Amino acid sequence: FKIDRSVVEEFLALDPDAWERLNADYTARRRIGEACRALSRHAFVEEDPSALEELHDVLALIYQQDFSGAPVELLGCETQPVLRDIAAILEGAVLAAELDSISEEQISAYPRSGKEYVHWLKRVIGEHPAAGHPFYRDFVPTRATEGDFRFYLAQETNLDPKFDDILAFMQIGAAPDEKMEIAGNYWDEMGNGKPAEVHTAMFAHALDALDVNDDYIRRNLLPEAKASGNLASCLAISRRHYYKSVGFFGVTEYLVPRRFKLVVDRWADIGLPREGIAYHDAHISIDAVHASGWFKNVIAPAVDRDPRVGREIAVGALIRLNSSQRYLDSLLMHLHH
Amino acid sequence: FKIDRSVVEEFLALDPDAWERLNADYTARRRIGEACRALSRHAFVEEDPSALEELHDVLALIYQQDFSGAPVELLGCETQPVLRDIAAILEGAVLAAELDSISEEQISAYPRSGKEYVHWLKRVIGEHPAAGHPFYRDFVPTRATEGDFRFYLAQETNLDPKFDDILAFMQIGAAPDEKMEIAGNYWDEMGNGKPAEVHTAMFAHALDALDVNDDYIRRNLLPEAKASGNLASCLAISRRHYYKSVGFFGVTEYLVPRRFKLVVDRWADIGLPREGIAYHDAHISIDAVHASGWFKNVIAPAVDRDPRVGREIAVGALIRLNSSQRYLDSLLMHLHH
Ligand SMILES: N[C@@H](CCCCNO)C(=O)O
Ligand SMILES: N[C@@H](CCCCNO)C(=O)O
Ligand SMILES: [Fe+3]
Ligand SMILES: [Fe+3]
Ligand SMILES: [Fe+3]
Ligand SMILES: [Fe+3]
Structure with a gap:
């Protein structure tokens, strides 16, 4: 069988x-x-x-x-x-x-207090090549066409269209400071009560703008893009993966502003529809705030409550970084050819 | 075994x-x-x-x-x-x-449009004895002591302490109008971003006020109170029980204002701590708004999208009403003796 x-x-x-x-x-x-x-x-x-x-x-x-x-x-x-x-x-x-792919030395020499742990993790993130990947740093600003962006957005359906429910799953059972930060992030994702500002709705507009339809997605979704989306789903839906999720989605929020600024600037240069870039444009400032609140109010209190969870948070951060690297290397390899 | x-x-x-x-x-x-x-x-x-x-x-x-x-x-x-x-x-x-306990005639002669379905369901709810149960209508206003309220609040730990996560589970995958109403309800549950106003926090204060400690709860939790809480959990965590949950928690919001007004008025008459009744006092007006939004923005759009779900919503409403009746009859029977 x-x-x-x-x-x-x-x-x-x-x-x-x-x-x-x-x-x-x-x-x-x-x-x-x-x-x-x-x-x-x-x-x-x-x-x-x-x-x-x-x-x-x-x-x-x-x-x-x-x-x-x-x-x-x-x-x-x-x-x-x-x-x-x-x-x-x-x-x-x-x-x-x-x-x-994760060594024990990578996830064990962290400082066992919250504020210090945040500085350590940002340094760890900054060492990883996914934190400055050539797809965003190099290819997007200089070469990306409308067809490149269409292919890219198909890959991004792996995560962005369900980010509000990832957060809703994550905060189940969370301690108060962490829960209140995740809750405020979720409420931002739901446009703070305004349907036009709901993040999944604005992402759908980007897909519409380049005709990223369901058949195009099905035929073009890369295996590493599917793995990325499955990792996100896997970690969010189990309570026991909460602390991995804290690292995984903390890295995600942290890296969005640098990545999206590159996408938005190129999208303008090649004259693509202004209405289609509202999602990415908005997230440049939104996720600078989300990333700041995530470190200060999710990661630091978790570590201060029980420093043992710094190891799980670090594993989740590295799973996000490693899986993003494989996904972006595969994407950039297909877009070159 | x-x-x-x-x-x-x-x-x-x-x-x-x-x-x-x-x-x-x-x-x-x-x-x-x-x-x-x-x-x-x-x-x-x-x-x-x-x-x-x-x-x-x-x-x-x-x-x-x-x-x-x-x-x-x-x-x-x-x-x-x-x-x-x-x-x-x-x-x-x-x-x-x-x-x-649910007959087919009870869940099939509903009108197959949203606004009309809401009127039908309110009538169906109003026929059920749980909608005006003597525990709240009769015993509370005339007889309830501090020890009665302590015993009651122990039973209420079956549901109130996890209501925010019930809503977070429920809205996973929900259609936009329904999701936005549930999301706004959840944000209210989290004090609209103010920790002092988080509903589970204020409910914990009621427990503190009457020394409803974990040992008292464990020794006094009635079997029907456990069944009530398990039904709530069962329905919220499975996507396939979403439409039952819509009815179950719609009935819940609808009945809170009448029930809590009786509790709050008695709590004052017998001089119990003002700080302890903030949760129930606040919910008298909060859940009048929640109940109105739930019918208008969850139930009516679901039925208008697919009238077949009116049968599931009706089953969930009757599961809530029936299980509340068994729980309150058991509670009132123990409090009399
Ligand atoms: N897909 C994007 C980030 C998605 C975050 C969702 N924003 O709420 C990335 O991989 O950087
Ligand atoms: N336990 C109460 C209602 C609980 C609703 C929670 N409020 O957010 C009852 O059975 O009426
Ligand atoms: Fe977002
Ligand atoms: Fe964000
Ligand atoms: Fe509430
Ligand atoms: Fe409510």
């Missing part, structure tokens, strides 16, 4: 009674889990590229179920016993592979 | 390697699932009261893991394959029992 995205599409087409029968059959469920371990081995031991893409296509479909409004025809289907077992197996393998 | 709360406490004490070994053993996992079906049968077929309380003690512990900040020692433990299978089995039985 082999598992791939089409096998899971078939599961999601089952009616509520068929799901109940599957959930009651632990032999069928053992076989599904074994098929996931086999796929995980092809993807990360053999490092077969088609198995790696298949694995992230499967995870992406499962997270679609976690993040999307359920359709009426599926409201009676108990998908958690099977889908959560699949996700646990594939996630475990994705994260073990990320951790293989 | 029997499953109870202490068996699941033991699972949660396992280290990450022991969890990995358990997750890989589908024979052990088949036995856990079979033990859950056996407990479910004792609880809802035999209707054994100790099995029913044990079942909700198990669910409550699992939802604690979904809703609480994870402790550092547990960050490496993959609990989803087993805990989600347990929850699916016990939840399926809890909800089947709720649906046994």
Whole structure:
């Protein structure tokens, strides 16, 4: 028995009674889990590229179920016993592979107090090549065309369209100072109550401006872009990944202003529609504030409450930096060719 | 093999390697699932009261893991394959029992348009005895002592302390009008950015005022109060229960002002601490606004988008009304004796 995205599409087409029968059959469920371990081995031991893409296509479909409004025809289907077992197996393998790129020295010599930890982490971020990647520093300002931006925005659908729900998942159960900062960030994402200013709405306008339609996205989404989006989903939805999420999305907010300023300036130079760049233009100042509040009110209080979490925050920051590097190197490699 | 709360406490004490070994053993996992079906049968077929309380003690512990900040020692433990299978089995039985009390005529003759559906649902709510329950209408204004209120507030820890995260879970993936209303409600719950005004913080002050400490809660929490809190958790955390949640928490907001006005007036008459009633006092006007916005901006747009969801919203409203009735009848029965 082999598992791939089409096998899971078939599961999601089952009616509520068929799901109940599957959930009651632990032999069928053992076989599904074994098929996931086999796929995980092809993807990360053999490092077969088609198995790696298949694995992230499967995870992406499962997270679609976690993040999307359920359709009426599926409201009676108990998908958690099977889908959560699949996700646990594939996630475990994705994260073990990320951790293989992270050394213990990288995540252990931090200062064990909040304000000092923030300075250390900014330095650690600044050492990493993703903090000044040539896609943004070099290619965008000098070469990027409308078709380049269209391809780039297709990759960016991996994360930006669900950022408000990432934050909503993250703040579940969070301590007060951290929760209040994440909550204010989420409220900004929802336009502070004004529909026109909702961030996902303005990002959708950028997609419209370059005709980044769903078929173009499906055909052009890079495997490393899918991995990036799956890592974001993986970390946000589990309480036990909260402190990794703190580092992962802290790095994200921190790097947006430098990256988006480059995108916005080029977008203007080549005369692309002003209406389409409102999202990126707005985030240049918004995420300078978000990044400042995230360090001061999420990271520093967490470390001050329990310095042991500085190691988890550092791992999440490095997972974001490493996965962003692989994604941007792959993107820049496809855009050159 | 029997499953109870202490068996699941033991699972949660396992280290990450022991969890990995358990997750890989589908024979052990088949036995856990079979033990859950056996407990479910004792609880809802035999209707054994100790099995029913044990079942909700198990669910409550699992939802604690979904809703609480994870402790550092547990960050490496993959609990989803087993805990989600347990929850699916016990939840399926809890909800089947709720649906046994709901007739098809109750959830099918609604008008298939939003504004009209709102009037229908308010009428349906008004027919149900929980909408004017004697605990609030009769006992509170005339008899409730400080010890009665202390016992009551212990029961209310089933829901109020996690209402902000219920809303955050609920709005995941929601359509824009509905999402923006839920988001504004959540932001109100977080004091609109002012820590002193965060609703869970002010509820904690009410608990402090009557010494509703964790040991008192543990010893006094009624089985129907646990069932109420578990139903709230169950519906909020699954995307497929979104439309039930819309009805369940819509009824909740709608009934708060009448109930809390009775509580606040009695609390004053018997001279209890003014500082302790700030939460309930504030919610009298807050939830009149929340209830109005919930009907207008959540329920009516959902029904207008797809009238089929009026049946799910109605089921969730009746689950809230029925479970509130059982809880308040049990509470009033213990307070009389
Ligand atoms: N996709 C962009 C950042 C996305 C942040 C979302 N803003 O709320 C990047 O990778 O830098
Ligand atoms: N526990 C109360 C309502 C709780 C609503 C929370 N307010 O944000 C009741 O059962 O009426
Ligand atoms: Fe944003
Ligand atoms: Fe931001
Ligand atoms: Fe509230
Ligand atoms: Fe409210």
